[PDB]
Design a protein around this ligand. Sequence first.
Ligand SMILES: Nc1ncnc2c1ncn2[C@@H]1O[C@H](C[C@@H](N)CC[C@H](N)C(=O)O)[C@@H](O)[C@H]1O
Ligand SMILES: Nc1ncnc2c1ncn2[C@@H]1O[C@H](C[C@@H](N)CC[C@H](N)C(=O)O)[C@@H](O)[C@H]1O
Ligand SMILES: O=C(NC[C@@H](O)[C@@H]1Cc2ccccc2CN1)c1ccnc(NC2CCC2)c1
Ligand SMILES: O=C(NC[C@@H](O)[C@@H]1Cc2ccccc2CN1)c1ccnc(NC2CCC2)c1
Lengths: 306, 322, 322, 302
Amino acid sequence: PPNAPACMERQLEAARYRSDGALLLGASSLSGRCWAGSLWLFKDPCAAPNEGFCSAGVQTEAGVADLTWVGERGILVASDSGAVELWELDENETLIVSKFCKYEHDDIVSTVSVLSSGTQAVSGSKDICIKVWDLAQQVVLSSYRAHAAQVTCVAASPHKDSVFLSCSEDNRILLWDTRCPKPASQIAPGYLPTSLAWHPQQSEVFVFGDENGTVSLVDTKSTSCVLSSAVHSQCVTGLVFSPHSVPFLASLSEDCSLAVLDSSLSELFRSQAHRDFVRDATWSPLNHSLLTTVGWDHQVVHHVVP
Amino acid sequence: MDNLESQTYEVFEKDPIKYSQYQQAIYKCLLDRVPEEEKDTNVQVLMVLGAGRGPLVNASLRAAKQADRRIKLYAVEKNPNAVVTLENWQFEEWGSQVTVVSSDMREWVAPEKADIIVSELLGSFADNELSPECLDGAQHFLKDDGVSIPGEYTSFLAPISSSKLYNEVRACREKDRDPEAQFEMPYVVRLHNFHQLSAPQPCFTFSHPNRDPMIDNNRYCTLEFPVEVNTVLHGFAGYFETVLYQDITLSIRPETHSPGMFSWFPILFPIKQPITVREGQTICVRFWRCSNSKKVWYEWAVTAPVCSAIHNPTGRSYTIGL
Amino acid sequence: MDNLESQTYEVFEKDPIKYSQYQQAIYKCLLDRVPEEEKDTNVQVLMVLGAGRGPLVNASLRAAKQADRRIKLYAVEKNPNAVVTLENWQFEEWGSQVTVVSSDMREWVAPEKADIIVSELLGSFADNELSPECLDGAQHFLKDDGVSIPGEYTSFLAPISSSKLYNEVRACREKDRDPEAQFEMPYVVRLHNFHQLSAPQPCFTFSHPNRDPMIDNNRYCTLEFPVEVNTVLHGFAGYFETVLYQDITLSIRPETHSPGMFSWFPILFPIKQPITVREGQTICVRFWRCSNSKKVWYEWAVTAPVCSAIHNPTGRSYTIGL
Amino acid sequence: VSSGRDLNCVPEIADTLGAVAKQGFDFLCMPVFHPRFKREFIQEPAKNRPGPQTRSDLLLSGRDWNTLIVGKLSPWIRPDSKVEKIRRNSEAAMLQELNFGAYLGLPAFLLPLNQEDNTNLARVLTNHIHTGHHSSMFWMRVPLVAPEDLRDDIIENAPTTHTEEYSGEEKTWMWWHNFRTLCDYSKRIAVALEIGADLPSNHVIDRWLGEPIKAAILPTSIFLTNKKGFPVLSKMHQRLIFRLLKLEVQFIITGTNHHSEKEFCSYLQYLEYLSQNRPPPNAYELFAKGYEDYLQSPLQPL
Ligand SMILES: Nc1ncnc2c1ncn2[C@@H]1O[C@H](C[C@@H](N)CC[C@H](N)C(=O)O)[C@@H](O)[C@H]1O
Ligand SMILES: Nc1ncnc2c1ncn2[C@@H]1O[C@H](C[C@@H](N)CC[C@H](N)C(=O)O)[C@@H](O)[C@H]1O
Ligand SMILES: O=C(NC[C@@H](O)[C@@H]1Cc2ccccc2CN1)c1ccnc(NC2CCC2)c1
Ligand SMILES: O=C(NC[C@@H](O)[C@@H]1Cc2ccccc2CN1)c1ccnc(NC2CCC2)c1
């Protein structure tokens, strides 16, 4: 395709399925001469990561630390440059054009999450700040310095536009509600929280992974993590719930494995297909049994979960 | 024990003859190893043992193009910082032809045997950078008929007079160590204000590969230097000669010095006390190359016209870590 | 790196409990390994790794007679001078039952696997005589179900006050070395005029055999010592406990000290500058066990109530040669 | 004014250096390895990650590495982590980055003091200082006010302390003092003092007097805006700049442009404006110049 680069960078950072079934890929060059990034669209997920078989592709100024779909054509990127950037898929869906590139963070933007309405987004950074964006106005609505160390993860609630979670190296898990004068609420200190995921049906339930490879289930109202499991031998990088009525939970780690857990956090599936850090997992909206993972080993693996 | 800096590799890469001599040696070896009828079917496995930032890798490739022969290259390097340069060059320029290996040649488990092992592990006194020990741990992955470039090297010694250098060594006294340790260690120095008192004589020789049942890198040499002048002995200048392949050689001996070659300066083995030498007297020096599993060192003593103390016993002042 | 003198082996052979404890451990292990029905058909292969002049060899033989079980003995010893005593005793007393081996346990190619490996390579601080490294190089010739006596050992530390010992260490300043090197090294000392400021706490633990895929003998420990007295910190006393087999143990911890056992005196890790400690304050100490392929050492620092300098960084003042 | 630019994103090293030099900066503080490129040293398969591990030394001349580049330790390196695996990988990675900086001959290398316990970080740095032959400076990035003490009061169930804490407010000086005590006053270890939007009380500032401050870190976010839209500093910030100018510190500008209508070199132009408008040297200072903290043995008068 035109404007698309001939080569894809080795370090695959993100993989996101669209409702129709198209695959969004985020990649960075974390070594060699150039430290840039790239965004890719694959209408055929089996073709990934082959550049000559993509629907669309574009080069970003810097690496892609994180990304998210903004509807069906929008792509919101957390950049190494300190910019939050919105990219838009064109009418024919063969080009990826930049809508905005706003440099509001003073260090790497590590995490981005679109709020329930789809009109606003939350970004977290190594600069310790959390910002709330208005996507149409292309501006920052609010800037929050609640944490005392780098923001590791920001996760917008599935159904409440004013509610989100954040975790940081300051060992805090914050529950946010922007309708309060003091918007954050801290929900004994232990291992650092590294990943967050809201339960898709239980509006007050969420899961968190830690640097020690443990996954824990929390109820915001009760404020107690009575359910936990030692899933990984290393840092829990990501947590992704399946699209099922009774969802399964995918947990990805720096130990290079993927694990699929049930409601009681018991293991149903374990995959060691990756030979480097597993960076993202996306469940297929077309086939709910299919789970796609990306890694720093440039592998796009398609898993059949029983 | 230490890793070389980027700028150290940079200056030595500017040597006007070292690399063209290495290229010429590899070129001659390829023609002698594979005939014209086999030029498109026989792929020679070349291993650059201590590749640095890659100049011997380029010399090997240029030699294979010159010989019109096929080669498969391995670039082994223990310095991980130099490995960064090697892996960036392999991705951008060399490709699949060159396999970069980040390892010590003594610990690397090679996936196949080599036809040719190319290395430049030589010191000013030939074996003082532990080329014998490194190549001994690497010869197991060399074919039974395999060639080592260099094939042999010989160190040379010459007695010298220099009151200037004697004073420079004397000024090297440091706190928190033996007050005479500075006289019991060699120095790399571009000798300038001195008097060579007798023609250099060969000291120690090593050959590669070493197919002897009992390999022993320890050495003991007695040298007798005729002196036809009244003078004062202050130390010994050390030089070397190496046979890269057949007639392709390198030398830092003043009489046979390779032109423009600055990659090695001479070595100086001092003596604690200056020794008076009269016309017609003979300077007798004894040198020992010693070792254990952890280190290598030299011991030396003057036995004529007068005895000196044994210098550096047990490597108390100077050792080269293995 | 050094070999023990004849009289050093002689005095320690007079220990009234060390050997009877070792005998009791071997006795219990033999009964648990071979049942009554197999007492005349099953021959257990016992290896004394670091046999010295042979007291653990006699302890093993006495234990086999006590258990009414059959044993085949190997007495491995790296000290060739101690090997003279072993080979003279084997010819005159033991016979074919005991095979004497003059070798390092890390380099010996055993002709068969052992059921039981018996050793006493412990230092005052348990692992400071490199028992972990020696037994790691010896566990390959131990059966998959094989037992190591001792099975585990733990070092203990306690903060101490002693202006007398501080002065003794201070007086150890030597010429031709760093003027404060004496404070960056441990000393074996029968501590007498001192004040233990807090109860000993466990520091480092090692288990044998070590069946982990990645064996790592390096360690890092943070200890917090409650102090209920006004005082001055001068160093740390080091002790150890060992599990020979199950409930058969040895200890030099003052609270659980094995009676009459003089085979180990405590160790003292000094600090360069005395530290004032007030009633109710906590002494925080950090200890590191460090290593490379050539040596092992400790690094230590006080972080509360005040920080000290890191002691012995890179083993600049003290190392235990491998 | 000797000034530097701090950057945590460097897509192309030659383009970036050229861009910062054009802005008027004398040096660039940058990562030597990609800041997000976490590396495994012990467990397979991540340990066997194919190289290169970073970009080549060939991308710049020897002169450029020696004079224009200040290295930065990667943010994921945590030698004092509560997790054993993180402590071990971080030690191996810290030694790797420090030795790569020594390999390039960097004039200085930035390491952070962002928490109270930096014992293992001090131990690893001390080990590096006493290994091999190199003479690079270590700049410890330490803030006047700890991020935990300057956080917005927006956590409903965790309010910020309103009562004064005299010694508690000087806690970052203790982080520095403890680290340099462990490292046994190495002449190679200095301070890179990070200034924030709200200056602490005078006693907190004065704790830094007599300390080896080599650099002062000025985030773009601490700059106020004037009627013309140019970045400026409050009177209290200017007072601290004049104090640091007497110490001849190197000023480092960190963060993105917060005055987007104006060019980036405007933050630097304000610093040189302050430097040009400082009090001129008096008669005493004209002769005493160059003798600052230089020890002289007193003469034997007789
Ligand atoms: N035992 C060893 N294993 C691997 N590399 C080694 C070993 N000993 C030395 N080297 C490397 O060998 C190189 C020796 C240099 N004199 C040669 C550099 C380069 N090949 C040249 O000709 O310029 C250095 O890069 C050393 O790090
Ligand atoms: N790596 C080694 N290989 C063989 N012997 C060793 C090794 N390390 C230490 N030894 C010997 O082990 C013995 C250790 C002594 N503490 C024990 C002596 C004797 N077994 C006893 O209990 O009295 C000494 O004789 C050492 O020489
Ligand atoms: O003998 C030398 N050093 C060791 C010698 O073994 C050296 C070490 C070395 C290291 C890396 C790459 C190649 C080489 C070449 N072999 C030496 C040291 C300093 N300067 C020299 N020459 C100057 C540079 C401008 C003229 C020579
Ligand atoms: O701790 C001691 N030395 C190390 C220790 O590891 C020691 C070393 C050793 C050496 C050979 C045989 C057995 C042993 C026993 N283990 C020690 C040193 C000097 N004297 C001691 N006790 C005296 C002798 C009269 C009371 C003890």
